[PDB]
Amino acid sequence: EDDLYRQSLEIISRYLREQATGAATSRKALETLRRVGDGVQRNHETAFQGMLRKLDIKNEGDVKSFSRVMVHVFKDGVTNWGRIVTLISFGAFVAKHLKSVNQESFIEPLAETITDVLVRTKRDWLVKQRGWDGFVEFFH
Amino acid sequence: EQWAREIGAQLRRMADDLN
Ligand SMILES: [Cl-]
Ligand SMILES: [Cl-]
Ligand SMILES: [Cl-]
Ligand SMILES: [Zn+2]
Ligand SMILES: [Zn+2]
Ligand SMILES: [Zn+2]
């Protein structure tokens, strides 16, 4: 409901939708997300598939399950770009998953959940880092 | 709960490596 928030939801939603469907600051972040995020998905494919299964076994809602898991990642009080990029990446992996089970309409809310957790709970952190400009330079 | 803790820590460790 602000400019960090809508700019975050722009990047995340876009990345998740283009991953599922196979194909200034925001656009640079998206480029970085494609480079790094596609990497994470290749290299942690076995782990991601294991986690997806686990989520599905406990069928409590894919985007809600994602939300609980995502909150737990940050419970130790540490925040960093690795954590943020790994979660968006796992989000993309789950978004591809939702598309393969003819549940594309759940991708938009997935994207919102991730953004909510990010901007709502890590705002202070995101500001000190110069938002998505920090992200781009961290992985540059 | 334990399955969400396990998955969360699992993502945390790989994330901290990438970082
Ligand atoms: Cl790796
Ligand atoms: Cl938690
Ligand atoms: Cl890694
Ligand atoms: Zn599922
Ligand atoms: Zn927890
Ligand atoms: Zn790794």
CA neighbours closer than 13 Å in the CB half-sphere of residue A25:
12
Identify from B11, B16, B17 which residue to disrupt to test chain A contact, counting A C-beta atoms within 10 A and taking the largest count.
Answer: B11
Searching chain A, which residue's CA lies closest to the CA of residue B1?
A: A68
How far is B2 from B18, CA to CA, in rounded Å? 25
Three-class secondary structure of residue A58 per DSSP:
coil
Experimental technique: X-ray
Short-list A28, A140, A6, A135, CA closest to A82: A135
How far is A28 from A138, CA to CA, in rounded Å? 12
Ordered alpha helix ranges (H), A3-139: 3-20, 25-43, 45-57, 62-73, 81-100, 107-128, 131-139
Query: Is A79 within 8 Å of A31 (Cβ atoms)?
Result: no
Hey, what amino acid is at A82?
G
- Cβ distance B7 to A54 less than 8 Å, yes or no, reads yes
DSSP tag of A77:
S
DSSP for A33-49, written as a single string: HHHHHHHHHHHTHHHHH
Query: Is A66 within 8 Å of A113 (Cβ atoms)?
Result: yes
Q: What is the Cα Rg of chain A in Å?
A: 14
Hey, what amino acid is at B5?
R
Identify from A43, A69, A80, A114 which residue to disrupt to test chain B contact, counting B C-beta atoms within 10 A and taking the largest count.
Answer: A69
A2-139 — its CATH code? 1.10.437.10
Phi (first) and psi of residue A129, to 5 degrees: -90, 0
Cα A96 to the chain's mean position, in Å? 12
Q: What is the resolution of this structure in A?
A: 2.0
Short-list A95, A103, A73, A88, CA closest to A39: A88
- Cβ distance B11 to A81 less than 8 Å, yes or no, reads no
- Cβ distance A51 to B10 less than 8 Å, yes or no, reads yes
Domain ranges (residues) in chain A: 2-139
Three-class secondary structure of residue A65 per DSSP:
helix
- Close Cβ partners of A58 (under 8 Å, ≥ 6 residues apart): A65, B3
- Tell me the count of A-B CB pairs closer than 8 A: 55
How far away, in angstroms, is A88 Cα from ligand 3 center? 14
